[model samples]
Target: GKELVLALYDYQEKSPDEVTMKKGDILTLLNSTNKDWWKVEVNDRQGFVPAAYVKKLD
Candidate 1:
């Protein structure tokens, strides 16, 4: 069993409010060309989240 919140923006950790992201309302991940990060899809928008945010379920 596990739990997590999906990323909603291509945000940087400048501050809590400063972290800009698209409004995310789904738990899906999108692929990016960057190895360090991946493009994630949420709320019909795409954003970059660290690979760490994604994981395997099987």
Candidate 2:
């Protein structure tokens, strides 16, 4: 398996979604997105986001 890496930008959310995530600033994928969408956690609130906005640096 690849080491998952996720970085956050100042992108805003306009939808709803969920994914098991860590509480830290850095987000890691315990599972791979086989064409799945992206989500982010901000101020402890999370939501769905376009996968295109994130970068997976494995």
Candidate 3:
């Protein structure tokens, strides 16, 4: 499994379908195909975030 680290706060959406994250939050990466958006999950919630805002963790 691949892991991603949130590099900034992204709260554009407040729904269950949206994954809101804070700086330093760790997320489970679901997909990275899109260059601008990435699918991720955190604490049972999943959504898309800015690709540039997250980094892959070994």
Give the C-alpha miss distance for residue 9 in model 2, angstroms.
Answer: 4.6
- Taken over the whole model, the C-alpha lDDT of each candidate is 0.48, 0.50, 0.77
Candidate 2 has what TM-score? Answer: 0.42
The lDDT leader among the candidates is 3
What are the per-residue Cα lDDT tens digits for candidate 1 across 1-58? 3333454344553433222343343445545466766565545555566655454333
Ranking by TM-score: 3, 2, 1
When 2 and 3 are scored with lDDT, the better candidate is 3
Native-to-model Cα distance after best TM-score fit, residue 4 in candidate 3, in Å? 3.6
Candidate 2 per-residue lDDT over residues 3-44, each given as its tens digit = 444555444444456534332245544434545565555446
Q: Which of the predicted structures, 1 or 2, would earn the higher lDDT when compared with the native?
A: 2
Query: Which stretches of candidate 1 lie above 4 Å from their native place?
Result: 1-26
Q: Residue-pair clashes per candidate, as listed? A: 0, 0, 0
> Per-residue lDDT for 1-58 in model 3, tens only?
5565665665465565666777788888888899988888888778887888888886
lDDT of model 3 at position 21 = 78
- Whole-model lDDT, candidate 2? 0.50
- The pairs that clash in candidate 1 are none
